[model samples]
Structure formats: structure tokens, C-alpha cells
Target: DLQIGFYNTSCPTAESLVQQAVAAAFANNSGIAPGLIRMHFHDCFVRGCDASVLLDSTANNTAEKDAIPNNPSLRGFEVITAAKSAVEAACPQTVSCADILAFAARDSANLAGNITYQVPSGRRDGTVSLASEANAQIPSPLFNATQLINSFANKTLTADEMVTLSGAHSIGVAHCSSFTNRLYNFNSGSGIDPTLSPSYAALLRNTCPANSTRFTPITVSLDIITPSVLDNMYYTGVQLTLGLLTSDQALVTEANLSAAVKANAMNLTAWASKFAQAMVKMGQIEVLTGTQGEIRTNCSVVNS
Candidate 1:
């Protein structure tokens, strides 16, 4: 539904400006890459590719930013903010926040260690931004394979797509609290799930404190080998039983779908290409067009 050059005539510099802004943001802090990717995923899932996730709370209601899934976790707002300033200066209100999100997400993907890819644009800012929707829409890190699949399917993402997108975890860091249960308290029929590698568990146990209370795995790279570059290392981690999230480990724990994990782990270029296409598809979900939504001057709120 969206086109690569949708803004060619209306805002010729829109894409390039976003690219430059993204580069600058990454240069300032390479850490922003994963944050942007996660935020974009959160945005598209909740209500199409609307910029609803970017909206701030207002007098009348609370916005997505304050939601449990977003608060204290979602980053890259300033990245979007800076890019919007750059895009607006060159193109004024001609570029919508939704379009900014798509473009910035693509740029952030490249910076996050995925091969460069372009995203189709022309999405308008959504009028609704509710925390309640996020709780229902976003997949939790604790989901099993079945739970994860349903979560992705709700947004029209496929089983294969879910596996491919999880590759994004390859470049980011996971707080132990997010996965410590997998290392310790996670009990199976016997005691600890034997599937987790003892060596891996030992490493994580040391990384996560034994005495002090920490809700999750202490901060650690999601992919031990290539934390800075996005790839199938996430699948490989799952293969070795070193997967960081319970959800991640569940890929292998569930015998039937582990094939997808192994297949993706073995192939690199194929997964990357599929990921690029999947993201484009993701960007187009439930999008507003033909004047269905407004292009807010400020991404944080709808226009008056």
C-alpha cells in the first residue's frame, strides 16, 4: 500500500534527511539502534503503522509512552524527535510521523547491524494512542513458542516471520531480569530445565548477582558472539541452549518449530532478505491512507 517514493514530489528530501538524521543519532550513541528497532516494532503492532506509540499522555487520557510495555524500556524518542526536526526543517509538515517512523526504522536497522534496506512510506499519525492496546498487542519475552506465534499472528506476521524478526535480538542487550528465570527459578518436571547449557547457565549465574535481588538477568549481550551486528546468532544461541529469553529458549524447547530456528540459523542471506521483506509488510499493516488519519505537526499529539 505504501511506495518507496511516495514523498518524491511532496518532500523530495524526506528519505535522505531521515537517513542523515539516523546516521547522526547512531554516531552519537550506537546504542540507539536496537531501541529504534524495538520501538518501531511496538508502534506498528499496536495499531497498524500509526505513530500512536509516539504519542505522549494528555489531559484527557494516558498515552502509549506511559504503558508498562513502553515506560522505562522504549528508547529512541529523542532520535525520532531529532529526525523530525530535521525532516520538518527541510519538508515542513509534509512528512508525517508515521512516515518518519518507517524511514527511521529502516535506517536504524542498517545501523543495528542488518544489511541496508529501504522502507516504503506515506503513513499518517494515528489519532488513538492507548496503553491498554499495547498490553494486548506486544509479545512478552516470557512467551512460549505457541504464545509467541499467536502474538505475531495477531499482527499478520507469520511463524517464519516471527523467527526471522527475533534475529533483531542478536544486536541488543537483555537485562538478566528479562531472562534470569531461565537460568535459575525456571523449573521443569525435575528441577532446572535440562535444555539450558550448564556452561551457559554458569556464565549467566555469575553475570547475574547471587545475593542482591535483581528481577532479570543482569545486563548482558543478547548474542554472545556478535552483539553489535544483527544476524542468525540469535538462532545459534538458541541452538546451544544459550538463548537469553525464556521465549528464545522456547524456540528449541518446542520440538516441531525448532526446524525454523535451525534453518534460519544455518542460512544468513536468506534470513536477511526475508527480514527485509517482512519489515516492509509489517510497515504496511493497518495503515491509514486517503485521509483516514491526520499528519500531526508534533508526533506526540494529534493536531487541534
Candidate 2:
């Protein structure tokens, strides 16, 4: 049976916070919307829907670095921290950090102008945080099809779930540090993978010049003109070998994932709906509930 709790009050779920946080982040950093969206997905996928992915590193001197070590372009921890602080000040010992992470994810996507499903509330925060576990679980941009499949499968996500959920890539950007190998030296300096046509390879090279320290995030929407809309354009791009990451391109080659790719490519609404469902499911993994941990008055440093 599904358990319920008092934390379910006071805007109880991550969805409310997500909407507010997304708007705040957008106001703070217009250019980093894409990166923030990507961060939310990374956090959820990495450590079973917990905001532990956003925790400040005890060893790092810079707080921003600790908040978003995985993302070079956007440090979303500040936004989340602010939200958490507000919640604690208004209603101490009430909300969960896990729900905060979910809210952040939802709001980030909303700021990008993508409409996702409503997220559930009442998730509690855990006392312990694990960076090593997050690093091990989050899929790398360099993973091949087999590795990508294994990564998601470990979470009990099916191939269709993998492809559809990855549609989140439609709104964000990746640092050159993450995808440089795919563009310049894929296949170990062999130039480009034959899987990617010469024309497409040249296009990537041109759009993402070598030595570009800062690069625009790779949106699933390949539209140079309208990149912010959530649509099936990303699926189509993946089919054409234009997927930015190795893990993304793998969907087209994997027999199990190909059908979902085509379905998404043909139906934008279906893609959006499935993406929201998968995202909510991703948010429900191994969560803390009902007094599992104290609700922090401040998101940066834990409650004292």
C-alpha cells in the first residue's frame, strides 16, 4: 500500500517548487536555461531521484562548483538552495530535499518552455549523501549502445523508456568537454565515425568548432530557428545520426530502441506524454519519506 504523511501539506510535492524555481532561475540566468534543464535530468537519473546530485562538495572551496560539478555551463544548485532556504524559513522540518530536487527538475524544464506532467509530493530527504554512487549511476556522454542500455536497465527502465526519456536532451546544451570526443576524435582520432555521414560530421564540426571552451547545449530539437519547443525533432535527429552524445546515437542503432525512436519521431504529443511519465517514474526511485531526514532551512549547508 502507498503510504501518506503530513509533509503532503504546504505545497507538499516537488511540482510546486519546480515551477517557482524554474521561473527564478530563468530570471537569474537567461543563457543557462538549457544547462539547468540538463542538470535536473542528470540529478534524477544519477541517484534515484534525490537532490544529492546537487549537494555541495565538502572538499571543494567553491560552493557553486560543489553544486554543479558535473555541469560545466550551469550551476543550478544556487536556485535550489534558495528555494530550500525559503521553504525551511516558512515551514521548517516539513519538506524533503528529494522533493526539492524534483521541483527543480520540473521548473527547469518549464523555464525552457516544455510542458511536463505534474510531479508527486511528500518525498523525504535522506541523511546520507553518496557522490560515488551518483558518479557510477549517471550515464556518460561517451557510452556506446550496449553500455547505455545497461545503464538504464539497471534502473529497471526499458529500451523504450530510455529513448523517450532522453528526449529531455531537446532543450539543453553540453560543454565541449563532454562531447568533444564525439565531434573531433570519435573512434579514437579516426576523424569521424562512418555511422555519421560526412555531411553531418562537417556540420557538427562547423557548429562546434574545435577548441570551443564554451558551446551551446545540444538541443534535441535540431531547429536552428526554434530550438526551445519540446517535440519529436530530437528523435528525428537521432535517426539521422545527428544525436550529440554516443549514448543518444545508440538509440537509433539498438534494435529494441529503434521502434520507440520512430514512434517519437512521428508523434510529438505521444513523445511529450511519454517523456513526462518517464520523468515522474525517475523521480520516485529510492526516496526518503516521513521523517527520514530533517528539512533544511538552507539548501546550501544542512540544517543545524
Candidate 3:
């Protein structure tokens, strides 16, 4: 079982070392905060926070790192690597890369959102990371509200927690390719998604032009109002129809979800607390505890 001070007896400096790495990265580039947050979320959803997402693909098998749903977008792997190296220096083979990921994510939230919570440690790293599993497991940017809820539910997370976690969008950027379909090719008549505010849709067109839809390097903020802060602003952005992805705007399609969104948008403290709790819950998804998995020496490769 995971414990709040799991490293206190084994490696007292483990969590702090991870925090220092994340803080240094954040100091150099605040974007690292959101990057780590997304990294942790992706890691958990695919194979239950196993650090499988960190494994390097081998000659015979494709790993989650290069998966279509994950590649080219997931950043901040370096932060966790640096953290693992730091902890390894203090207590070799003592801290799991999985726990480093969890700690980095918590540090990111504290840095970006000023939201704090205790994370239970003791998660072990998994050995498998199939691209096909990543493709099937991770929720897509085009998913509707129901699909999104089902996706989270598949992981045993509630719709409320899903909405709370989506608040992390307050700090990140999305590639234009992830949302251009909503802008240029909606459905039968109107080319744009009607749910999007007209002005916001026009603003997006400037960044993601009609012909530039093929995974361009160009990117747009998930929350244009405040792109680098993790806060309730994302809930407000969704309410204003400024949600960058179709999946984002889908939150309001259901009345119960819309109510949750509205509640979150109006209160920062309440949402921040919920976000912290939800993150703790997310960190626990199908984790490998006890002797089920190994404490990988190198996060990118399973120990021989």
C-alpha cells in the first residue's frame, strides 16, 4: 500500500529532490509546470501510473512514448529523468520512477496553481508500454461529453473528477491540429462548430488556417485568457465557449456537467481543493504496489 511518507525511512530526500528538479525546470520555463502535469495524467490513464509511458521503444516493439495519441505532444519527460537521477544519487535503487512522476506532478500543481495536497507514494514501475494500448486507452481531443465521461469512468474516475482534472487545461497549449476540425469542418451547413463563440472561432482561424490542418507545429493556448496559470479560469473559458478543443467545449453539452462547470468557474478555492483531491485519486488508478513491479533503475529502460 502507498503511504504519505513512504520515502522517509528509505530515502528522506526523494520527494524534495523531485521537487527541486521540477522547480528548476519551472524557473527556466514556466511551461514545464503544465507539461509535467499532462505527462503524469497521460502516464496514469494508459497503464495505471506505471511509468510505462517513459520506456523507450525497442527494435521489436513500439512503446507508449511514440504512440500516436501521445507522441509529439507529451513533453517534460526530461524533468522526471532529472529527478530520478537526483534521487538515484542520494539512495540508489530506492525511489521508483513512478513515484517521481507522481511527485513531479504534485510539485507542478503547487507551482502553477498554488494548489497543494499530499500524495501517497510506493507505486512501482510497470514493464509494458504498447502503442496500441495507448491509442485505445487515452481519451481523444474529439470525444464528446458522454465519451469523455465513459473514458474517465473506465479508469474508475467520476465525471466530476474528470471536469476537475480538465481544469489543468488552464495552463497548457494545444496544437492547432487537435481542434481545427471544429473550426473548418463542422457538419452539414456551418463549417464551424456552433458551440464556439464567433469571435473565438475567428481568433483560432488566424492561428490554424483552413489549409494548415495537417499536424502543424503551430499551437494555441488552451486558456487564452491566462495560458500559464493553473486555476479555475479553464472552467470559465469553457463557459465562454473559448474552450480550444471540441472535447473541452463538450463539457457543457450535458446539464449535470454544465452545472459542475459553472460551480467550478465561480469558485477558485473550492475548485482548487477538488482538483487536488482528484489528482490524488488519479494517481491511485490501478497502481502496482508491493512486489508486483520493480523500482526501475533507469526510468527509460527496465532493469536487466
Candidate 4:
């Protein structure tokens, strides 16, 4: 079973060790905060919060890390590697990579957005990983509000929590390819998604050319106003029709969703609180607790 202080007796400094690694990494690259946050979300959503996302593709099998939704986009695996190494040094075979990722995600939130929450630990590493599963489970950037809601609902998350957790976009960067569809050939009439603000669309078009290069892909901050800070600015951007992804701007297209966005835009404190709770809830998705999974020696490789 998971507990807030799961490692308190066995490994006294386990959580702080993970936090130190996150803090040290964030010090060099402020972007790692969102990277780690997104990494954890990807891990949990795909195959439960079991660290399967951290596994590398082997000679015989493809891992979730190589998933279409994850490859070349998900960042911060190095941060998790660093945290896991630190935890293992002091408490070998005592902490799970899954728990370290959960801790790192929480630490990243506190570092980047001043959001704080305690993560329950003791999740074991799942042995199985499949790229196909990730592609099927992760929500798409092109999803409309209804699709987004349904996607989260499949994971047993509420629409309110989905809106709240979307706030993590306040810090990360999204590749141009992720949202370029909205910039060109969106529709026959306007040639762009009508929901996107004209000025913002123009700005994005400049950042992402008509034909984005596959080799050297263009990346733009999800929130231009405060790109590195985790804050309520994402909702504001969505309200202004500046949501980088079509899925982002879709939040305000529906009346109920618009109301949620407006509330988040107006109050950072409320959003932060809800965000922490949603993260905790998300971390619990189809978790493997007790003796279900193993604690891997190397996060990328399962134990023999």
C-alpha cells in the first residue's frame, strides 16, 4: 500500500534526495520543471504510475519511451535518472523509481510554480511497456474540449481535475508540429482554426513555418507571457485565444469549460490547490502497489 511517509523509517532522506536532484536540475534548466511534470503525467496515463515509461526499448521490444506521443517530445528522463541514482546511493533497493518520479513531479511543481503537495509512495516499477499502449492512452494535442474530457474520463479523472491539471502547460514548450495543424489547412474557409486569436496565430506562424522541418523541429513555449513560471497564466492565454495547442484553446469554446478557465484565470491560489490535488489523484491511476511490481535496479531496465 502507498503511504505519504513510506520511506521514513527505511530511508529517512529519500524524498529530500529526490527533491535535491530535481532542484539541482531545475537550477541549470528551468524548463526541466515542466518536463518532469509532463513526464510523470505521461507515465501515469499510459500504463499506470509504475515507471514503465522510463523503460528503454530493448532488442526485442519497444517501450513507451518510443511511443509516438512521447518520443522526441517528453523531456526530463535525465532528471529522474539523477534522482533515482541519489536515492539508491543512500537507500539501495529501498525506493521505487515510480515513487521517485512522483516525488520529482511534486518537487518540480514547487520549484517552478510554488505549488506544493505530498505524494504517496511505494509504487513498484511495472515490467511491461508498449509504445502502442501509450499512443492509445495519451490524450492528443488536437482534441476538442469534449475529446479532452472523455480522454481524462477514461482514466477516471473528472473534467474539473482535467482543467486544473492542464495548468501544467504554464511552464513547458510544445513543438510546432504539435499545433501546426491549427496554423495551416485547419479548414477550407479561414485556412486556420477560427478559435485561435488572429494575432497569436500570426505569431505562431512566424515561429513555425508552413512546412516545419522534421530534422530541426521548432519549439514554442506553451505560455509566452510567463514561459518558465508555473502559474495561472495558461488559463488567461486560453481565454485570449492564445492556447498554443488546439486542445488548449478548446477549453474556452464550451460554456462550462469557459467558466472553469475564467475561474482559474482569476485565482492562482485556487488553481494551485486544485492542481496539487489533481496531481495526487492522477498519480493514483491504476497504480501497482503491495507485491504487484518490482523495484528495478536501473529504471530503464527491468530486473532479471
Cα lDDT of model 2 by residue, 247-276, tens digit: 777787767788888889899878888887
The 10-residue segment with the lowest total lDDT in model 3: 207-216
Pairwise TM-score winner, candidates 1 and 3: 3
For each candidate, the alpha-carbon lDDT, in order, equals 0.81, 0.63, 0.90, 0.90
Candidate 1: deviation at residue 286, Å? 0.9
Per-model TM against the reference: 0.92, 0.82, 0.98, 0.97
Model 1: per-residue Cα lDDT over 1-304, one tens digit each: 6778899898998888888888998999887888888888998898888899999998888888877667767788988888888888888788999988888888988877657777788788889998888877888788888999898898898988888888888887776666666666556753345777877777778787644233332478888878888787788888987787878887886666698889888998888888888888888888997587987888877899
Cα lDDT, model 4, residue 92: 90
Candidate 2's error at 57, in angstroms? 1.3
> Which scores higher on TM-score, 2 or 4?
4
Residue-by-residue lDDT tens digits, candidate 4, 1-304: 6789988899999999999999999999988898889999998998799999999999999999888878888889899888888889999998999999999999999999889989998898999999999989999988889999999999989888889999999988888888889989987576888888888888888888777633346799999789988999999988887888988988887898899999999999999999999999999899998898998889989999
Single out the weakest 10-residue window by summed lDDT for candidate 4: 209-218
Q: Candidate 3 — which pairs collide? A: none
Model 4: residue 272 alpha-carbon error in angstroms = 0.5
- Model 1 regions more than 4 Å off: 188-191, 209-218
